[PDB]
Design a protein around this ligand. Sequence first.
Ligand SMILES: NC(=O)C[C@H](N)C(=O)O
Ligand SMILES: NC(=O)C[C@H](N)C(=O)O
Ligand SMILES: NC(=O)C[C@H](N)C(=O)O
Ligand SMILES: NC(=O)C[C@H](N)C(=O)O
Ligand SMILES: N[C@@H](CC(=O)O)C(=O)O
Ligand SMILES: N[C@@H](CC(=O)O)C(=O)O
Ligand SMILES: N[C@@H](CC(=O)O)C(=O)O
Ligand SMILES: [Cl-]
Ligand SMILES: [Cl-]
Ligand SMILES: [Cl-]
Ligand SMILES: [Cl-]
Lengths: 321, 319, 307, 304
Amino acid sequence: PRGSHMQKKSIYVAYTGGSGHLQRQLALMPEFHRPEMPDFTIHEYTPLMDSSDMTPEDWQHIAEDIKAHYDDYDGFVILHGTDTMAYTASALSFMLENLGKPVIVTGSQIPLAELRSDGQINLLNALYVAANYPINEVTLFFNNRLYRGNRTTKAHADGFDAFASPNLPPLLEAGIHIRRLNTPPAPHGEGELIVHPITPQPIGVVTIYPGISADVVRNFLRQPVKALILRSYGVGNAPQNKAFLQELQEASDRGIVVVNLTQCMSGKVNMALAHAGVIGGADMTVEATLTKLHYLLSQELDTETIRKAMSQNLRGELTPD
Amino acid sequence: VPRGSHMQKKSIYVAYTGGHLQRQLALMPEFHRPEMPDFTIHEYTPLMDSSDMTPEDWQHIAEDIKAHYDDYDGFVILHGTDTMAYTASALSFMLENLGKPVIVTGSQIPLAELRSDGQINLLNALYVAANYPINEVTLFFNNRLYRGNRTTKAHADGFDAFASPNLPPLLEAGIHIRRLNTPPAPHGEGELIVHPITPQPIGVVTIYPGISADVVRNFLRQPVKALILRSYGVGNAPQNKAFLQELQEASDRGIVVVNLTQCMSGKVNALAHAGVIGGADMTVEATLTKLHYLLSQELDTETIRKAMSQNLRGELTPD
Amino acid sequence: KKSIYVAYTGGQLALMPEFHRPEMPDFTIHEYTPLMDSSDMTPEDWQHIAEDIKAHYDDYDGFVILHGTDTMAYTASALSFMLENLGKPVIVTGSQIPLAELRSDGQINLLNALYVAANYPINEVTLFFNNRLYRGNRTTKAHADGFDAFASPNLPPLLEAGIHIRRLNTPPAPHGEGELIVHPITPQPIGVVTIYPGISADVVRNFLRQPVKALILRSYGVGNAPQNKAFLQELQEASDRGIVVVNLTQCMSGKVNMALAHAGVIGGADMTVEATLTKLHYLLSQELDTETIRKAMSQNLRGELTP
Amino acid sequence: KKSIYVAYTGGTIGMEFHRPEMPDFTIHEYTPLMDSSDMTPEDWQHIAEDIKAHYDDYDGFVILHGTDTMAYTASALSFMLENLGKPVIVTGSQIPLAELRSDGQINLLNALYVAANYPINEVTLFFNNRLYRGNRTTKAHADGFDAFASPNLPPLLEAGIHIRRLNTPPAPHGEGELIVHPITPQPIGVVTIYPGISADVVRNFLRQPVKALILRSYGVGNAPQNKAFLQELQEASDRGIVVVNLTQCMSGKVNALAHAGVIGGADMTVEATLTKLHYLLSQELDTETIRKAMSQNLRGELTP
Ligand SMILES: NC(=O)C[C@H](N)C(=O)O
Ligand SMILES: NC(=O)C[C@H](N)C(=O)O
Ligand SMILES: NC(=O)C[C@H](N)C(=O)O
Ligand SMILES: NC(=O)C[C@H](N)C(=O)O
Ligand SMILES: N[C@@H](CC(=O)O)C(=O)O
Ligand SMILES: N[C@@H](CC(=O)O)C(=O)O
Ligand SMILES: N[C@@H](CC(=O)O)C(=O)O
Ligand SMILES: [Cl-]
Ligand SMILES: [Cl-]
Ligand SMILES: [Cl-]
Ligand SMILES: [Cl-]
């Protein structure tokens, strides 16, 4: 949407990490205080966190912070470390039902306090976008592009273009003008914001590679697994090993949700593993699939319902057949 | 990329590992023109879907190249796409004193099917092997020749299936074949030496929020001599004491722990004090195969750790 | 089983068994006489092709135009305007390497064009190259030596080919329903002026002799030229004499957003030179007054510009 | 501590910096300040002579410039400056520094930082985290922050968390005292080849006022073989006019027209070719020497 510019918006900034130094730095930067910029309020988290140290509880914290302040602001910017920004953006998309205001995750590759920082520009753009292009999704702003949150990954560890959306175009691109792209809408509810709990869930993340043993699937099966993510080859292939397919069939028998993804940057799983109870994850990222599992396992649903929900497009994270 | 002489008719050996072909090729005139090298196809028995490959299969192919080395001018390895990058990476370490091209290629669509990329990937690989005899294990796909141990299958559904995220291509094909100025890998001299491999239990942990110290403990049970960590960004992992202790325990037991980025591109830069070795800008495919190579040698733990961070074959960018 | 007409205009198949496979549509090839290097094409050649499609329209399910790459984007662009109410796909394609030469891309672009025309029909003049289908009047030859020879700078492709073929969510062109209309053209003198440091009023003055009905300006950025008083006056003198003067960007991508406007100059939005030139040949060939032509140039007729 | 000279010539940009990691810098605001769309070749001269005056007293040079003709200026400076021993970096912004979301501050900060810490002794163009060879650039994207491209050459340097020099082959590079070549007005035409072009266009440029003609031809340098066209081109060369054939395409290399006197410009941009012509026409060289020099790699502008 191209939102109206008639009244001065108020944006809430959840400074999660990524004391008082940010807020003072922004005070000192005139760009942030111009007439064309929305008003904003910073909530600095205590303690501030390196995003590498994040757990699902942290997603919950942030979602509760949004719900607390929802009626009081026009939009939300989540300032976050880059390392797991994509996991947080993906988690929020599932947790937040009936979301009728923009939530934009952003941050920087270089600290605001350093030289050549991208923080100023990413945060300025996020605020301006949240105020003027109020897309009702959890999104991620980086390097002049706004992405669907649950479509992103950090693709480039050293680049300012750190984030990609390998299976979906950006929602918006910033140049001389801000351009909205033809990207199709996610499913949308109606009424007041509902936060669905995401709790800790033991989920294993198996990379498929030559020489991987059945012992891996057997080892996960011992306890730390209610779900298992397979990063398989290409369009979702794995070794045809009888013991391997046995241990997977066994897993699904014990009520473990086994989800097949591609280890590739882009592409779509096309489903043998299906006969072993494995569910296809279509073109979902690991970040979307991990958080979607956390979401569903923490909800009031049985194993069959979770399995079916995993291949369904819930929030724009997957492209239906 | 050397621009090799055209003056005489080359002979290329084709290892058809998997991924009827010979009859199809007999039936395609382009493969038999005067400008094309002569070629000889060894069809493997059985043919393999590359998804079913194990390190033993890398060994088999390396022995195949060694057996036929003196007899041909170059080698094209026809291979399934799913694990092409692991095979290409494995060969780069296993072959030392490589004085002839070895080019891995295949297709996203079968030669028999409609709209196949097989004809053009194989035609180009043969032509390149004959005329641009780069002495490395390379991977040809979709008009680019890549350093093998720099590749991954990045695009599951695209004809541009392979990328080389941390190194430009060695060569690009258009109206003209253009060799790029990518710096050369380290090179030995004399007859080809195959460094063999034997099975090595290696874990691949992905770092993701909520991952516990009980994960590293789990790998430390029976099936692990090395652990690869797919860490965040420039090599970051949870810094909680339980996690860092499990890692130090692992290294105290002689497990080689190597820190990579889970990101498509970039370079890894705490964990060090816990015995974790940085894998710089290496792919999982390079790192996994490098470990298979190094662990199969009679090398002490300290030597393997050191060698992991060293550029042995062009797979990493030194400081 | 679909049947595709192939116009081989210039820019063997029996010796390749893939083309005759059961999955392929039926196709017929008409070899043109003479066969032409696309560098040699005149606007009348666009007419010959348009009329050839017209003759064959009712009897085939789609159309493939085999064409040299040098001016393929001009032909695609022209056909888009000349064909109105198009109800079947017309796909222009070719090769960077001659079919007779090694490593040729000709066979695979043709097979793809045939397959796509049959199985994923899009009722527009399109250009297929290197696994992508582009809107014809958004194209240019951007890469003289590459197999990815063509780009569509201001519009995503309409379709992409991998293991599967995927239609993209690219916004449709304004599309008329009804009987196919084929608009003939007649020769029109049009000049193309590139804006560059040290350009003189003389250039614009020269075109104002006797050989010009329209002038295309390839100006800087979003449509700027030096503010030289003599230059501006020559441009005003151009429009006074009924010459249609259209401002484009010389840049590969972007949108003109304009003075020149005071001098009678019309903004061409994000139109390529190829779309602008052919659109001018189209409009000038009709029974339209100068003011109606000037208005229509800035309107989106066939998906060639973004309003 | 390094000291960088900044020539503020004008442009969009003008319509952390003093922190301890930054080099010292001095800004000279030109009078008048110019929209780069208004630039004439004599303005290249004023800039080259400004760099000449300040050369000895600074470690690097940053040229602040409008984007519309930045690539023409960068290209010109590369020919006019010979034996360059310090970095000259041209940059600017798509959004005025006064406007919101401006790229001005970050392009300038980067250009200053790069000139000081990663010096490359070439006329370069810095934009959107990349440093390009000046005479290989074009403004490719009118509306984008990634405004500039270098279609036939990779960038020389890229900035991320770290700044890295890339393995781009160096330009031919003279050692010795800096030589600054003045230029003088030269009438040059630029002809685009397109279907339905007439011999009259070439005939008109042969009216009185042209010393050179640049052809933007198809593909690898083709044009229609119209007898009248080919004859007018030949007449132009007979009159001593330098006719150079370029590709109208964004990338690639030019490879009867030759029989008509036309010189192949290889993979040179229009910007490089035009300015190279201004340079060579301004020196005291035979038409034949000029014709030969046009196809030679003088400053890294073409691939031999
Ligand atoms: N973010 C992603 O999931 C990228 C890729 N599919 C991976 O397995 O890591
Ligand atoms: N091939 C690769 O290693 C890509 C990426 N670094 C990953 O962890 O999967
Ligand atoms: N095809 C094009 O028109 C590209 C660009 N606008 C040019 O002036 O050449
Ligand atoms: N800068 C350039 O020269 C791009 C392209 N060769 C053109 O003719 O416009
Ligand atoms: N490791 C840091 C990187 C950063 O954002 O500065 C984080 O993601 O929290
Ligand atoms: N799964 C197949 C894919 C292919 O190459 O066709 C393989 O890797 O062998
Ligand atoms: N010069 C040729 C190039 C080709 O298409 O093969 C043409 O455009 O007609
Ligand atoms: Cl990176
Ligand atoms: Cl893909
Ligand atoms: Cl090219
Ligand atoms: Cl643009």
